[PDB]
Design a protein around this ligand. Sequence first.
Ligand SMILES: O=C(O)c1ccc(C(F)(F)F)cc1
Length: 544
Amino acid sequence: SMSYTWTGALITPCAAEESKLPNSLLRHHNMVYATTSRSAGLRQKKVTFDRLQVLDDHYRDVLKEMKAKASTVKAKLLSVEEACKLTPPHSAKSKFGYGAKDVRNLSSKAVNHIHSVWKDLLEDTVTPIDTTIMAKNEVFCVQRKPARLIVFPDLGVRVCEKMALYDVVSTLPQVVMGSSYGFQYSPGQRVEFLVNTWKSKKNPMGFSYDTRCFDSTVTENDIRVEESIYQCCDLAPEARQAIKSLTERLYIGGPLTNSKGQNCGYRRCRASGVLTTSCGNTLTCYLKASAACRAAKLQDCTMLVNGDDLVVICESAGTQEDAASLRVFTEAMTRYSAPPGDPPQPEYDLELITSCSSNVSVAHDASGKRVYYLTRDPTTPLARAAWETARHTPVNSWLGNIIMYAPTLWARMILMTHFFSILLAQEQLEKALDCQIYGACYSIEPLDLPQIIERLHGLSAFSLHSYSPGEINRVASCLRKLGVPPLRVWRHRARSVRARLLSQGGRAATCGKYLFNWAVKTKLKLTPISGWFVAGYSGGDIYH
Ligand SMILES: O=C(O)c1ccc(C(F)(F)F)cc1
């Protein structure tokens, strides 16, 4: 079928959509842009085509292996009270006369409605359910992306999603997929897995496979296979009924309706703004790739999967032979409706492989021992930091990034230094800030950062010193390209920040002592002092 059919109704905005950036961080402001519904049609073209699927015994075997592990899972129904408490405080309100604030408080109005929606789910398993469609505002650096299309149902339905399925998507994918399940590893844990599975091959080869508009390539068949998997779990008969109804009424497809309530069309592939999306894309990406591997006779594969992001490390057969089997792999994925973006390519250096927009690099700790940490090209982080210091937003990529990439040269000298400069300058150190980790929203106290970092990265994250040339180039170029003060200017800024912090005692002096010990010259002796990196929730409207 066609992934999407369109009525002609525009995909419409909610309020003003700033495309441009209104400075000590970055000079070239005309390189930072934000996507708008103005880019919607261009995206619409990219994301709509017919889908021709052809399976094979490799698909059917993997799926059978998958359903057998899924059968050892037992999942429970979530109470209204529990489902409500998971909803973010600024989650889009209901078109039925209540908001997320009402939900969280267990207002009897929201809750009675949620009940009514669950009752309807149990009685009617056919009638398509209504979704809103929207162009996302995401910031990028120039060199030019169309807005991505977020699709999601009403708040009432979402609390029901949570009820029927939150426990299943928190638990199942780990069991089905074991060590390939990306979202069980914190970044340190993900480096360890990548580094160890690389060391464990005689003669290693690795490729990342970027799939062309994944959400579009997910067929209605795919989303039913996905249900059949969820159903293998041991379940309440009421949860099974709800799960059947939600996939048939919502996950498979339904009507698109814009901000002004006009009919925009109809969708027959993955919706980005539902609870099953991460789990679904992960199970569906793991199934197809695992099969493509077998088709292409790849030797002794370990895979890592986070939604639609794929990395395979395997045993090389030779540079010719590798290049070749990769083309078979690609043909296999295409048959499975998971065609390629940039075509994939063998690497023989872990450092050059990029997965989850990120890669492994090494540097050295206090005593001189070699140490592997996760990193990434810092362009989107700086961009968004630039953006986020300019216009106020209640999202803070900067803080999530400081957490994910704490050991990195850039997060320490640029992000840490900058925002701590602002937090001190505005006396806003004690304030909780909300940030995204694997699509879930956590409320974090910036002053806690030292412990947080100690527990996810160890003390060496406060003392890492000889970063690799290739990484130092990436960073310094990124800074020239974006017009950001070179690294020597931050060292001097960071000495100021560190000192002001040190004077305030308590957790503020501990931030200063630990976060900025890289910047002193004579270093202090740095001694010691979560359900976070468990599962992927992007799109699923989750708050802990
Ligand atoms: O899903 C994500 O947004 C995400 C995935 C992976 C990573 C990391 F690089 F640490 F592996 C970070 C964020």
